[PDB]
Amino acid sequence: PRLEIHHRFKNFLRGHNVFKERISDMCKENRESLVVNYEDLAAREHVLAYFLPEAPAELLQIFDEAALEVVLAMYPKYDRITNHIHVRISHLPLVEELRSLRQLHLNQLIRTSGVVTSCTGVLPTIYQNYQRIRIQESPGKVAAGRLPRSKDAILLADLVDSCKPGDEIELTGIYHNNYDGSLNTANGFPVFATVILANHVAKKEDVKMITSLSKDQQIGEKIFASIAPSIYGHEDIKRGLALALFGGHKVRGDINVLLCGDPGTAKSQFLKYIEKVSSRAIFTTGQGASAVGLTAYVQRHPVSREWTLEAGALVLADRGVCLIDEFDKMNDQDRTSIHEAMEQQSISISKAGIVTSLQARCTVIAAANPIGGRYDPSLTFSENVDLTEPIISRFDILCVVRDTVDPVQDEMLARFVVGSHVRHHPSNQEVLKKYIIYAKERVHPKLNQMDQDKVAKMYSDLRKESMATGSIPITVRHIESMIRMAEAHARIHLRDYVIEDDVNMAIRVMLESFIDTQKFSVMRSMRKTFARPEKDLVDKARQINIHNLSAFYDSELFRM
Amino acid sequence: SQVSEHSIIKDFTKQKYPEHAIHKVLQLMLRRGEIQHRMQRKVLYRLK
Questions:
Q1: Which long-range contacts (CB under 8 A, 24 or more apart) does B13-18 make?
Q2: Where, if anywhere, are coiled coils annotated (chain B)?
Q3: A296 CB within 8 Å of a chain B CB
């Protein structure tokens, strides 16, 4: 640019106590961290604010040298600790969600966010010193939902091993088009040919008026009457779906929500309508999904790529919501791999060669397509399928369409058909959308010792129903799913307890699985639902569900 | 068909054979004198 900037730097090196207090944060303990705020320098000296639009690229180089002036004069010791000083320029207002995402806007420090999709962490000469990570550009939104062009990020040996795939972080930096492959003596870089450095890592009001609406129970009943108004569905089906919609110490668990209908019904499209309410949106599409969409292929590799870690749809929606559609288009081999991962909410490798860990925090929602007849043969559903039996029986609830000749249903759906043209003809619950986000993110209940007993009493009542004529044919795992469902009730009614009326409907959903497997004669037990040493170790197991009987506050029992 | 050299590696997965073990096998199949392998492996190497 100019040549007079060196003199201005020389003059600019001649309140700030916080700089002294902040720089000393790193010490003998080797914290390897230094928080940098831009505003204090720019507030004291307005000349620094003017350098933002003129020379931002040199400024980073200039910023590193000026920091050393304090370090070199006081503490030469930091020269032998990682042999580098990390600059962490803070946020720089502006904030454009869609306006700055353009190739014309290079040579600017830009703040945005993204979600990590895939990486090459499975691996143990200027370019060899650093590695590669894949970042997305459009975040999840109704308007931003259009498919973007993927950004390619490069870590400068600074955030390595500190970040994991699927982390909703904030990306900030300046966009320089340092594509070194134009000389045609190397490999090729993706479309956004830009060395994007990572400088930040994120966390891993009408609401007050909205909370007023929460107290009403008139709106609390239509919550399962308003999610799917297109087809009017079935009241049993939506109630279970709504419970998972809220998503509400060895705290493990699985929510296996499966549907059995037909693709022609908009149920296949019904899963698509949910993403409007959901804050994070996942594209399924079947084959050719986002990144590696559960399909494995091997081809001839480019000039320089390494093996890819297989990122399941679960990983691609970490701490979010993941949607699974088109069940028959999955590969069989991946189904076995993720089956244990779904139950364990993580990925385990026993090859002793590659070790890694990925998180899984979403609700698995998918619909299966029946092979041929549903229950036409006199044999069981699992034993007339070439697939393995036990994996099929892993699902807790099997939702299937009931009845096929419903003239009443035909009537209401018929008028909706005309409504299709009505909306599309020329013509001259968003309030509830923000309800779910606020409750699930701001309300974090704790554990109460005096309230676990009362809920657990009724669970035993369910057991004794099968203990009269039978031999322990029911497993507690089915109940284990029920506890989280009753938790979502408190979000609904805001009463902090659960009424038997809610459980009775929850009972029917639980029993629905038995209906599909057992002959219709079991429908008589619904009348009673309305009305309602080696041995020694067994007895204690039910009452406390702890192997040790001396686990009652042992921390204060022995010392005090 | 479809059981060429580029995809038969997937078949080895079902046989509990890692991709490193087949290397001792796949690279030595030409020394075995297999009729089918040589026609597939050599003709497509440069002639296409």
A1: B13/A333, B18/A351
A2: none
A3: yes
- Named by the residue before each, gaps in chain A exceeding 2.5 A from C to N are 14, 124, 204, 248, 428, 532
- Rounded Cα gap, residues A163 and A75, in angstroms: 30
- Solved by what technique? cryo-EM
Binding-site residues of A, in ranges, read 268-269
Min distance B30 CA to chain A CA atoms (Å):
21
Cross-strand pairs, B29: none
Please write down the long-range contacts of A241-246, taking CB distance under 8 Å and 24 or more positions apart. Answer: A243/A485, A243/A488, A244/A363, A244/A365, A245/A274, A245/A277, A245/A436, A246/A436, A246/A439, A246/A440, A246/A488, A246/A491, A246/A492
| Helical pair A500-517 and A235-246, crossing angle rounded to 10 deg | 120
Strands A131-135, A151-155: pairing is: antiparallel
How far away is chain A from the Cα of B33, in angstroms, using its nearest Cα?
26
Q: Which residue of B has its CA nearest to A351?
A: B18
Cβ(A287)–Cβ(A293) under 8 Å?
A: yes
Residues of A in Cβ contact (< 8 Å) with B6: 298-300
CA proximity to A47, closest of A68, A69, A64, A62: A62
Inter-chain residue contact B6 with A333, CB threshold 8 Å: no
